[PDB]
Curated annotation (Swiss-Prot):
Span list, region Linker: 305-325
Region (4H): 1-128
Region (EF-hand-like): 129-201
Chain residues that bind Ca(2+): D182, T184, N186, Y188, E193
The organism of origin for this protein: Homo sapiens
Reported disease: Noonan syndrome-like disorder with or without juvenile myelomonocytic leukemia: A syndrome characterized by a phenotype reminiscent of Noonan syndrome. Clinical features are highly variable, including facial dysmorphism, short neck, developmental delay, hyperextensible joints and thorax abnormalities with widely spaced nipples. The facial features consist of triangular face with hypertelorism, large low-set ears, ptosis, and flat nasal bridge. Some patients manifest cardiac defects. Some have an increased risk for certain malignancies, particularly juvenile myelomonocytic leukemia.
Post-translational note: Phosphorylated on tyrosine residues by ALK, EGFR, SYK, FYN and ZAP70. Phosphorylated on tyrosine residues in response to FLT1 and KIT signaling. Phosphorylated on tyrosine residues by INSR and FGR. Phosphorylated on several tyrosine residues by constitutively activated FGFR3. Phosphorylated on tyrosine residues by activated CSF1R, PDGFRA and PDGFRB. Phosphorylated on tyrosine residues by HCK. Ubiquitinated, leading to its degradation via the proteasome. Ubiquitination is negatively regulated by IFT20.
Record localization: Cytoplasm; Cell membrane; Cell projection, Cilium; Golgi apparatus
Domain notes per entry: The RING-type zinc finger domain mediates binding to an E2 ubiquitin-conjugating enzyme.
Other known facts: This protein has one functional calcium-binding site.
Functional summary from the UniProt entry: E3 ubiquitin-protein ligase that acts as a negative regulator of many signaling pathways by mediating ubiquitination of cell surface receptors. Accepts ubiquitin from specific E2 ubiquitin-conjugating enzymes, and then transfers it to substrates promoting their degradation by the proteasome. Recognizes activated receptor tyrosine kinases, including KIT, FLT1, FGFR1, FGFR2, PDGFRA, PDGFRB, CSF1R, EPHA8 and KDR and mediates their ubiquitination to terminate signaling. Recognizes membrane-bound HCK, SRC and other kinases of the SRC family and mediates their ubiquitination and degradation.
Subunit structure, as described in the record: Forms homodimers; IFT20 promotes the formation of stable homodimers. Associates with NCK via its SH3 domain. The phosphorylated C-terminus interacts with CD2AP via its second SH3 domain. Binds to UBE2L3. Interacts with adapters SLA, SLA2 and with the phosphorylated C-terminus of SH2B2. Interacts with EGFR, SYK and ZAP70 via the highly conserved Cbl-N region. Also interacts with SORBS1 and INPPL1/SHIP2. Interacts with phosphorylated LAT2. Interacts with CBLB. Interacts with ALK, AXL, BLK, FGR and FGFR2.
Protein name: E3 ubiquitin-protein ligase CBL
Lineage summary: Eukaryota, Metazoa, Chordata, Craniata, Vertebrata
């Protein structure tokens, strides 16, 4: 990734301007709900101006900073990808539920994560990547031992280092993990992304089993939603007290929020504090609040996560080995992803479901907007 100079910054601002103008189109009728691309790109522009200001008469130093170089390459690639999406999408961009339009939401989330990361690494415009404080102590010790004060690490190197303490036992597991951690979708892991991941999937001692059981195999997991989208989803279960879902929030990375239907006709949400999510969900099940994930009658049993020992390493190795298998047949490897639910399976099981007249996704019955080969 090349040195950042005045010309490159100029080209990025023009590319951002084009994306903003494409997204102002009244026919898209974007609601200002997060991630709101019409605020994010102006806000990213503004924070870059703050950086450039702090580095006035020091552009040669800023322009060589590795994080900054990688960020500006990604900003240019992501804006070009968004412009390309409109060009190829044509009138489908105006269909609220088209895949092109859902792809715009995905890019908008990425722009949101990129701005959060930039603000975290350049608070007030000054590079502070090398003094970034990782929240969880074990995760912080891991990063320092493997990487020192580095702000970003190529995925290939991050994987090899993490594997030494938390085995990544299969290629498919690695791809799923990368999609979870690499928020900015650029094949680098920053200290900021690592901080987020290790807060979400604490405790460190069972990191990857926590991730699998919360983000892969749990029907209550909604990934990034707004609170209005959570309420909209649970309102369908307003007459089933104990129905619950849990989500990430693009405006507050590193935290979970659990929405649930009460016994009195209300929907509330709780942000768990000083408690891993799985313990929050065990407690809430026992207490009668979190009974029916996404309104389903069956709730996962997370107590196997209760207690890096040698035993943890072996449990994670086994989970990672089984990860690649399609869980409908338990025979073929996963090789297709359903959109928009994101569930993975083999194409044999998808076909069999469809040939039997089965509707929507074989796991969750969500309508299939498209599929993507793995
Ligand atoms: Na990244
Ligand atoms: Zn299968
Ligand atoms: Zn599904």
């Amino acid at each position: 990734p090349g040195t950042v100079d005045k010309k490159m910054v100029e080209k990025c601002w023009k590319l951002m301007d084009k994306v903003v103008r494409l997204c102002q189109n009244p026919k898209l009728a974007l609601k200002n709900s997060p991630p709101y691309i019409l605020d994010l790109l102006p806000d990213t522009y503004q924070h870059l101006r703050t950086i450039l200001s702090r580095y006035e008469g020091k552009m040669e130093t800023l322009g060589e900073n590795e994080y900054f170089r990688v960020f500006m390459e990604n900003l240019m690639k992501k804006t070009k990808q968004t412009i390309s999406l409109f060009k190829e999408g044509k009138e489908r961009m105006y269909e609220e539920n088209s895949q092109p339009r859902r792809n715009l939401t995905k890019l908008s989330l990425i722009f949101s994560h990129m701005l959060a990361e930039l603000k975290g690494i350049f608070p007030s415009g000054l590079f502070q990547g090398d003094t970034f404080r990782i929240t969880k102590a074990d995760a912080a010790e891991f990063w320092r031992k493997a990487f020192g004060e580095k702000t970003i690490v190529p995925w290939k190197s991050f994987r090899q280092a993490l594997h030494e303490v938390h085995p990544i036992s299969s290629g498919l597991e690695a791809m799923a993990l990368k999609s979870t951690i690499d928020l900015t979708c650029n094949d680098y892991i920053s200290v900021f992304e690592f901080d987020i991941f290790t807060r979400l999937f604490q405790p460190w001692s069972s990191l990857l089993r926590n991730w699998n059981s919360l983000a892969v195999t749990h029907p209550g997991y909604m990934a990034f939603l707004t609170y209005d989208e959570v309420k909209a989803r649970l309102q369908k279960f307003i007459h089933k007290p104990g129905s619950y879902i849990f989500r990430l929030s693009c405006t507050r990375l590193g935290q979970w929020a659990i929405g649930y239907v009460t016994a009195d006709g209300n929907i509330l949400q709780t942000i768990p504090h000083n408690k891993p999510l799985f313990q929050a969900l065990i407690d809430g099940f026992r207490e009668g609040f979190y009974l029916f994930p996404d309104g389903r009658n069956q709730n996962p049993d997370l107590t196997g996560l209760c207690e890096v020992t040698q035993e943890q390493y072996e449990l994670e190795c086994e989970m990672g080995s089984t990860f690649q298998l399609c869980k409908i047949c338990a025979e073929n490897d996963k090789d297709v992803k359903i959109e928009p639910c994101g569930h993975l399976m083999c194409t044999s099981c998808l076909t069999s479901w469809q040939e039997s007249e089965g509707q929507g996704c074989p796991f969750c019955r969500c309508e299939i907007k498209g599929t993507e080969p793995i």
